[PDB]
Symmetry: C6
Subunit: 175 residues, 6 copies
Amino acid sequence: ISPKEKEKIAIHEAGHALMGLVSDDDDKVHKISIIPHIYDKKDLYNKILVLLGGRAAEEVFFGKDGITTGAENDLQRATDLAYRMVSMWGMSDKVGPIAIRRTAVDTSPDLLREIDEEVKRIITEQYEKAKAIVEEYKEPLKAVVKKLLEKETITCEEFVEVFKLYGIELKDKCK
Amino acid sequence: TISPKEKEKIAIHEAGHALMGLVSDDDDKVHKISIIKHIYDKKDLYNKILVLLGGRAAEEVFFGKDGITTGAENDLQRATDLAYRMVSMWGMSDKVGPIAIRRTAVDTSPDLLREIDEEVKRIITEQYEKAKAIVEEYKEPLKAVVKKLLEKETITCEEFVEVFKLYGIELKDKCK
Amino acid sequence: ISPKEKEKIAIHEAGHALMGLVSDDDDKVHKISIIPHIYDKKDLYNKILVLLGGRAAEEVFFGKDGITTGAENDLQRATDLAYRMVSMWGMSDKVGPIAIRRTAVDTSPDLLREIDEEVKRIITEQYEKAKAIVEEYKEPLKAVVKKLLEKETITCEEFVEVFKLYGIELKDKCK
Amino acid sequence: TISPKEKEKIAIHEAGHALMGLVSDDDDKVHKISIIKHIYDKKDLYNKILVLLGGRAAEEVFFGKDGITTGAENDLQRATDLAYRMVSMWGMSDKVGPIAIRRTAVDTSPDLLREIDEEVKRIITEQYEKAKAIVEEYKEPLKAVVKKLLEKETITCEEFVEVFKLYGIELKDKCK
Amino acid sequence: ISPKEKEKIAIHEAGHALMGLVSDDDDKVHKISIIPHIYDKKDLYNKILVLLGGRAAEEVFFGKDGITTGAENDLQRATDLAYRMVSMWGMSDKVGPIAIRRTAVDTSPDLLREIDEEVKRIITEQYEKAKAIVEEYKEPLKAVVKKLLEKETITCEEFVEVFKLYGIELKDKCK
Amino acid sequence: TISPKEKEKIAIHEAGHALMGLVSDDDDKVHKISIIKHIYDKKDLYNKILVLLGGRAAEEVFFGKDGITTGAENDLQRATDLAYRMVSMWGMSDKVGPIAIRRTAVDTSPDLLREIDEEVKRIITEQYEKAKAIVEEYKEPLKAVVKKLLEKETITCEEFVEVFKLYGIELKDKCK
Ligand SMILES: [Hg+2]
Ligand SMILES: [Hg+2]
Ligand SMILES: [Hg+2]
Ligand SMILES: [Hg+2]
Ligand SMILES: [Hg+2]
Ligand SMILES: [Hg+2]
């Protein structure tokens, strides 16, 4: 794996962690390296937020052209999750507290268009928030990336250490 | 595993169902509220939807739109299926009429599916609004139910009604 | 089975019988209780008429809210029958003397929309006639229901007896 | 089991097919009218539709739209299939053109299916009207055929033509 | 096989051969009777041309009503071929250098409408050219047909012989 | 079996791919031109399309729209699949967004498929135009490459670049 590619991965893996550590609710632990119940609407919004942080950080650091294939799963995981909010758990105002029956069964194309719209809406939103977040914290993120590329693997605590050195206090979610 | 946050959510969802059941002018059910060939008419099945929706309805009144939970999955699916049968199996919608979809739907037009979907959406929207209104209207005594629920982990309909009679509401029969 | 439910069933089973006994053509025999060739367009219209009589009587006696699940088969049987008239036996002017090929095969959505329209038209019609019929004969029907609820099972002849006592003479179709 | 009503219907349906066959300026067939690798051109298959439709055509002229029967099921299906091939297999429609649907149709646009359905509908409508017109125009001698049909239960084309020559119509050859 | 049918077949089989022998490119050999790499856009256009020659000749000689079932394969073979040009080999300007994925998979109805349009366009065109060709050479074609019906089987050379006797010089493609 | 006509076509198609590869400011590949878990970014895959399209691009510049060949089948299919993934698997289109089609697509709206198809069409159209422009701009030295190709049947990237340096173009590295 060439240094150019390592830089990408680094920015990407930092992005997730950033989202997790800021995420207003999203309960979840951490770790970070260059190698790899009942939820409410808020919880799932924040889960999407985390899932898009990789790609979000990619776009902040490299523009729309430095966007990577490495977010293939994250986009699928996030889109699935938004799709359940809309078609399974009535979490869309437009769509309403309806569930899609069965892989939908005998659903009008109009219902699908509505859903696809709302999935897009939800995802566009969480992704715009993630970019904003990466932006706001670009400088201390750069610092984290440097250490990442150097030591190859960071702990959750060091990530926080670096951010405290910048006056940003991240949520207590590490172990 | 269950955090006081999640446990509260459950309580409210559960108190929501029972509220709907006890006020439901038709629907009848075996109430026991915890944290751990026939013939139905249009009135009946509407009241079934009402009940099925109470949980989510309670979530929204109490926690706003963001507090809406995954816990209602089974509930929303049953409601939707039920309304779906009302429209496509029984002739229970005026727009669609006493027509029965050749059920998987087989060789039904996209136009018809759309009409059906709209009518399913109408039934549910209506009952959902009803459920919320009732929870709203009975927010006060319901809190009291929830407080005891969280405290003792399991309540009987009797206690539930006991709190309600205290507030001056005469809930219907239906327990054991 | 509770008395409220027995009343429903009674009205329902009376409705069919009424339709059969008045039905301008529909050849078919009878019996009535609280427990359970080559046809022309007229014949099949009347068969639909009979199939909808249950629900028709339900709506006359209890309004649109007292409508029951008990007509699940009747609606399917009737709708199937109208659907064959339209898609199998060219009995629709709008659609014309065309047959749908195979569970249709490779048929335009427009053709399906047309068919669905015509099926709806046919069924709406026969159902409006059945309601009208129940209406016109509500009083002697009430009488039949009473005896039904009392004796639990009526013969075709008694049904007629009751109607003759009202000056309505029903078609000779019983044995 | 067969009532005089039903038996009459059958007779008329059967007399309808044969009429079309005997007048059909192209189509050729083995006439025997009872109660109990090749190459066809556009003209030929049109005449096949004509024949296939004669039964129903006869029903409608004689009994109005309400007298239309189930007996034509097989007939309408064959006609429709035939016209369907004309349009989607052979290049026999001007609107659709010498295009052949990749036959189940595979990955054909909804637009194309609609065009095809319209053209199938045109062929059939046209021939149906033709069939009716002919039955109308020959109502009188056809009754006479039907009377003998009902009387003797089975007629030969010969007798059928015999009645027609008597009325002054010279039907074509095609029997045995 | 009746003489009327033999005349049809004759005209049909002559039509192909005509197309082959004139076809500006289409490499292909011949023979003719009353019984039965890497190509460019031009090559495939001409292959369609050959495939439609049968039907084309049928319509020239008998009008739109003398059109036969005998061209069932030719229309399928040609339509398949145009369909590959459009959906497989980016040979349509309207559609562009795109390939349809899999029996298409997950393709919009709009894309299919576009394709169906372009397939129709290509085929309409080649078929109008084939008719024109049959027209232009109707007289010497009649001559060929006569010999065909007489001797039942013609060689490629005789076909040419007849055309040379008319001052038309056909491409050197026989053996 | 291969006619001088067909052999020329092949040469040009092959010279087209290599041209694109050698000029491609990103894409890297194992050049050897004859007649016989990772991470890619948007820039990278665009350059892959460019390469995949070079063959056809070369065909069109040299032989016009009628000279377009069957030889590009595999090429067009790969390009299309790649762009299809860009749009529907990776969030690489602005119109569609960081949305991922639940892949066979499952229960996606006709509207979405249309958006996707349009965007796939945009990527490819753009890169196709790029490929052609480059072939156009380097028509002269490419002929020279083709002449040697037809002459010796197999060329190395080295020779290819050798001709290009002679014309005054400094192509990038990427060979062995
Ligand atoms: Hg990731
Ligand atoms: Hg629940
Ligand atoms: Hg019934
Ligand atoms: Hg028949
Ligand atoms: Hg042929
Ligand atoms: Hg290639």
